[PDB]
């Protein structure tokens with residue numbers, strides 16, 4: 001089974017993908033997590049990607065498509081979390097999968113309004129020791145636990161990221177709807193309720 005989680009930044013895709021991977025054994029492929037690691041390590045990918053991410057822009061397709069080929073697992077169920085983000089990426093994914101005898105089985109669209117996106121992103125915090133993700137209101141870090149705020153979660157970069165989502169990523173809704181594999185998730189609900197909906201959709 002291959003899943004794609006699609007939706008605006010802050011919708012809760014990483015939160016749900018992490019949970020699903022941990023409990024049900026999916027391979028979690030987060031392009032964001034992988035890129036942030038590349039940047040921190042200063043790899044050729046990381047050095048090239050870094051400034052796109054800093055500015056809230058998408059990293060060029062060729063680099064991301066190569067990254068996906070590098071990390072796609074030989075066996076196992078997969079959650080694509082934050083990939084594809086463009087039509088070209090989606091077309092490449094279909095082609096890659098077909099060569100492996102696979103296909104995207106479900107695309108889960110995490111619907112949330114812009115007001116919620118901003119609330120979610122502005123309050124997002126990370127434990128730099130473990131990578132655990134918190135929210136200042138909805139899931140605060142334990143007392144005494146040091147956390148950081150991503151530079152791309154600052155107000156002006158959130159704005160750009162949302163514009164980029166609407167311009168480049170949103171056309172994937174129709175792309176996958178035409179293939180009949182798009183499932184709607186009401187991502188505005190609490191984490192537990194969203195998770196039950198994810199489980200229901202994937203059966």
Ligand SMILES: Nc1ncnc2c1ncn2[C@@H]1O[C@H](COP(=O)(O)OP(=O)(O)O)[C@@H](O)[C@H]1O
Pocket residue numbers: 008009010011012013014015016120121123124125133134135136138139187188189190191192194
């Ligand atoms: N259903 C939810 N309700 C409230 N807060 C959430 C929910 N899902 C995620 N969050 C919080 O919102 C922020 C964004 O979640 P995240 O999973 O990182 O979104 P995405 O990967 O779609 O960008 C995080 O701070 C997370 O703790």
Ligand SMILES: Nc1ncnc2c1ncn2[C@@H]1O[C@H](COP(=O)(O)OP(=O)(O)O)[C@@H](O)[C@H]1O
Pocket residue numbers: 008009010014031032033035052053054056057058059060064081082083084085089161
């Ligand atoms: N599939 C992709 N294609 C191009 N750029 C990407 C992709 N995934 C992640 N990025 C880059 O990494 C940044 C952070 O992505 P991500 O962690 O997925 O954001 P969010 O937490 O909002 O889902 C993006 O704003 C973009 O610059």
